[model samples]
Target chain A: GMADPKELQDKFWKALKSDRTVMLGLDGVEDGHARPMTAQIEGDSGGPIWFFTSKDNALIAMLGQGRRVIGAFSSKGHDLFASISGSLREDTDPAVVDRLWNPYVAAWYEGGKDDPKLALLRLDADHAQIWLNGSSLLAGIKVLLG
Target chain B: PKELQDKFWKALKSDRTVMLGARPMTAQIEGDSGGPIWFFTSKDNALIAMLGQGRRVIGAFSSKGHDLFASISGSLREDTDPAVVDRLWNPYVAAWYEGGKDDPKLALLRLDADHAQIWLNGSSLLAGIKVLLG
Candidate 1:
């Protein structure tokens, strides 16, 4: 059985370090449920995390209503993924966007900050949980073969 | 300014998720090269503000339990808003504030947070006090 949301939520945060990718899930309006997405830490962090996406994206559209949202992050091949649920904030602070936007992002967006589609979302992670997966079966078999 | 605060939060609180009451903390100025700066630490459900020998200031936040603090040669003095300041400071901190303001062991350094960012625990928070400081 899986641990409760709160328990899993707490463990999720501890797993995130400098270099980790999270598989994000979003709530779709039509289904009134969450849909999965992906994100990697760009720069800086606190209670309220700032993220980037296209201006016309569905995530951007829902954030405008000043509603609550949730996000989940997990290890790539590992079992445990961090689940973070909080408010969706559309950041209007220019300096925030500027500082968060880096030259490294040129690989994704050509205009960078000037790109109108470059939108920042501040996720106020209210409660989070994490679920640690059992040992990987593949790793066990690899040791046997080695 | 915010960079200092970011480091401060990283020092204080658990994963940035401060308890509802742990408003202020006692963040020691590790390297005495700086004075001393502690943050939202509370006992008896009250707050303990930082004390300084001179005008020292760092950024502060109440909501979301995220405060980016630093001991950058600043002080803590009593303010006019007795009620508000009192709520922010307890008996211990109140005395510290008064003493710093009067005889002046510490003078409060203030910053205009109008252009500052907010930090909370476990969420995507930021603390870099370039507040108008390029």
Candidate 2:
């Protein structure tokens, strides 16, 4: 039986919460070059995802007035896959930054939360296509076999 | 280190799956050392439509065990050489192409990598940064 889209979507969030790394890239820009970044999500599944990065990051430089982007995720167990579409913009809320800060994040900055080079970017997901395990391959096979 | 580069190549061969562009793709790597990576894709795919001559692209890779990660930049183009196709064809490839090797939709895409940033498990983050700087 085919899995429900809602079910797959739920699994994607669960897996991402467990393994927060995702490959993020701008849509149709710089040949769609993507790089891995550790995501920070708080409150719930549907909210914007955050990343703490350097101000000089390429992705941030490209965000002139917010930009359409794609985030590709694969669970550490390789059980779930998701292609997330969203808008990326700079978010400089100090409270949110303070809430999400930790020793791991601090290592990258010499000035802790007050670091001059530290920057926060947010990705507000518009939609996503999620797959569980080999569901994509299975779906293709089913169509061909039928 | 030359030893680390050697290990990276071996690890990639061991785990053939990689995230090419935004999708997961199974790479066909030839030879003991790394060179161009190949993928069997459909001619009707959007990626194929973009490759009039060739185009620059990026790929991300993570080993099944999550021990190795790489971000690769390369050029992608179509190569329909029958000899290369025959060498890479297998039962799994046949599953997607109903007409087998003669399937009109079957197309072979090659990625000629120019730059790769790789991180291995147990390596310090500073080491990774140094490697990227180099």
Candidate 3:
């Protein structure tokens, strides 16, 4: 309640470059309590939050059947959360992959930026609504529950 | 066989594509009034309203700009233009008749392309067809 929600967010975030960082969903999944892993963010739309698991990752496997994913974001201290909902798509480009490469990430892959193993997910949140704490601590907790 | 291909195209045209394209809608008509949206043709039948780049046998509708579209093709018999209008247009009557142009009921519509080129799903479709269907 007392804290400004956006006050906790970091501008140089290593994870989310924009509104698209995490996508939780049950879009095409038949079973899963919390929701299937989904791609909810994209670099194209300002929010660069994305999921980059291997092509064989479980989340990647269920993207077909036209599933819509839920994107999620939480400001520092859970003060604010910005979310969007949309479908998931698998995409990969040498140019995009090259741009995404990091020196630290390169340590994990033998090919560095050249690794054809890199891939992408296109998450278009056709509709979106941000989560905020209505200027109160109670609102902060409420945002967490939803 | 040529006729069957044409029928498949008719199936995928607007009805099936709308039903499957964007997101699964709350309500929709089931079964292929025609069947299979994919078809192959020999020579190009001019008189027959087929999935050609031509007009007549085919009618067109687009929303959200050219972002969404359906091209139906198959072996089903053609509906007399009046019948086609009644079959397709009548449903809109249910939509418009219920709420007119501004009804929230109108938003209950959603459909997708049975055949399309998508960035993510498009690539996976080939791998899926080759590995699973083929």
Query: Whose lDDT is greatest here?
Result: 2
Candidate 3 Cα lDDT to native: 0.37
Task: State the lDDT of candidate 1 residue by residue for A1-146, as single tens digits.
Answer: 23544434334443553434544445445533354433433323335555666677666665565566656566654546455666775774688766666565556687767877677766666655444654211111100000
**TM-score of structure candidate 1:** 0.39
lDDT of 3 by residue, A1-146 (tens): 22322222232131245323353654545652233232323242234334554565556676664467665654444434545466666666666666666564466567665566655666654544444343211110100000
Residue B42 in model 1: lDDT:
25
DockQ of 3: 0.00
Give lDDT tens digits, candidate 2, residues B2-104: 5555655677778877787778877877876766888888888888888779899888876676656677778889997899999888898789888899998
Better model by DockQ, 1 or 2? Answer: 2
Put the candidates in lDDT order, highest first.
2, 1, 3
TM-scores of the candidates are 0.39, 0.47, 0.36
Error of 3 at B94 (Å): 84
Candidate 3 docks at the CAPRI level of incorrect
**Who wins the TM-score comparison?**
2
DockQ of each: 0.01, 0.01, 0.00
User: Which stretch of 10 consecutive residues in model 3 chain A shows the poorest summed lDDT?
Assistant: A137-146
lDDT of each: 0.43, 0.75, 0.37
Rank list by TM-score: 2, 1, 3
